[PDB]
Amino acid sequence: QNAGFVKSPMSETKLTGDAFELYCDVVGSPTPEIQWWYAEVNRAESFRQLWDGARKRRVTVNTAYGSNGVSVLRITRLTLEDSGTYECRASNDPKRNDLNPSITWIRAQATISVLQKE
Amino acid sequence: QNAGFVKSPMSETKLTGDAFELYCDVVGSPTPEIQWWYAEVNRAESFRQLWDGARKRRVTVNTAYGSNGVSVLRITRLTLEDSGTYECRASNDPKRNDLRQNPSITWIRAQATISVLQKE
Amino acid sequence: QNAGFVKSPMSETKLTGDAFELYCDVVGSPTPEIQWWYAEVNRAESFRQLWDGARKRRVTVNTAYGSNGVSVLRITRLTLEDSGTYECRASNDPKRNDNPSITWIRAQATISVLQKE
Amino acid sequence: AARDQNAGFVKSPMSETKLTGDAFELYCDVVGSPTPEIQWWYAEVNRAESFRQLWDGARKRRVTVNTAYGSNGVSVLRITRLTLEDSGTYECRASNDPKRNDITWIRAQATISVLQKE
């Protein structure tokens, strides 16, 4: 089985200072890798990988692997510039990390909108 | 600006001659539009919109809109060249259908891989 | 194939607070363009075009162009003032957008909204 | 196309097999009265739904297009640092129809096959 999404991240609107969590759950054989990506504008030139501890540890990534892969992306103390398009990426392609990055992966996107308190 | 995927399409392996169905389920206020897109290689240069009747009518699309958007993409009599990356796209942005824009900019995407194997 | 309605929108009665969805399905070769128009009274002077996002984003238009043109018009949080004649217009005439609107066909539906009293 | 077009191929792109990391160059040379326009198109699978126009700078500048119009039209398509995903059908399209940009184009196709380092 090529990687497939069983749970996808879900768009959400938030207030600055709040926090959000996005979830990802993927199946396949071999077990797929999960990565979280982001772009201000939903276009390939804008997408970059996020990681546990990004943005001075406002960003947290907890990922676990078994038969399936599961992950939560969490961002606290939200700012306006956290708005944009977030993405769970999954692949069990053996060449998936060989240095256009989306070519061997699948993607499932969510929109995050952060509004200013009043 | 608020559409989200409740259920995204699921990757699958099929044999030549069979059929597949992909399913896409989305929430948003107002109700988001749904589209289906495809590419042999998962890069924006190769993605094109599929539609009801495509590929000599082997492709059907059935979509229903209420509070949610729900759609099924079905392709019958599968061939090797039906393999690739398929994609549900959703949006309720009022400018989602303007032409002066990289098609993905006002949409969100949820992808599945379809592999079609030769009966032999 | 000249643009032709395979399914035309159907008149409905609603109560305030509800939503309605009208449906328009047109065949043709090439595939016809679809527009939605509205008027309080069925007179030419009162018809104007509905756009996605109108009426404080209570108006949605989701149109798909395949073999057929298939469109749904949805309006939420219905008020008494949303009552009227709603119309799907279709055309695959090459100069349909370039000679007034004589190149489009119309199919109408009445939406009557009553107070949830 | 027989009524409002008369351009014709004098040099056509040539199929070729290459290794990942290498570069290729395809050539097109077209005659007619008036001078015909040249475009380069590509598809993974030789079918109309997959064909898209390429341009100078495509694929993160790996794709180069150099076209000159004198009496005839001549053009070179170059792709460097080749990947497996550069494989497929490339074609030169040409037309000297007035309405050509509003089919009244003609095409000459080549197959590119990229193999990895064994």
Numbering used by the authors:
A (entry chain A): 29 to 127, 130 to 148
B (entry chain B): 29 to 148
C (entry chain D): 29 to 126, 130 to 148
D (entry chain C): 25 to 126, 133 to 148
Provide the authors' own sentences about this structure as they appear in the paper.
Plasma membrane Ca2+-ATPases (PMCAs) have a crucial role in this process by extruding Ca2+ against a steep concentration gradient from the cytosol to the extracellular space. Native PMCAs form heterodimeric assemblies with the small transmembrane proteins neuroplastin (NPTN) and basigin (BASI). Here we present the structures of mouse PMCA2 in the presence and absence of its accessory subunit neuroplastin in eight different stages of its transport cycle. The structures revealed an overall classical P-type ATPase architecture with ten transmembrane helices characteristic of the P2 subgroup.
NPTN was clearly resolved in all NPTN–PMCA2 structures, including the immunoglobulin-like domains Ig2 and Ig3. The most N-terminal Ig1 domain, however, was highly flexible and consequently less resolved. We therefore determined its structure by X-ray crystallography and fitted the resulting 2 Å structure into the density of the E1-Ca state. The resulting combined atomic model of NPTN represents, to our knowledge, the first complete structure of NPTN. The Ig2 and Ig1 domains of NPTN do not interact directly with PMCA2, but Ig2 appears rigidly tethered to Ig3 by means of two hydrogen bonds.
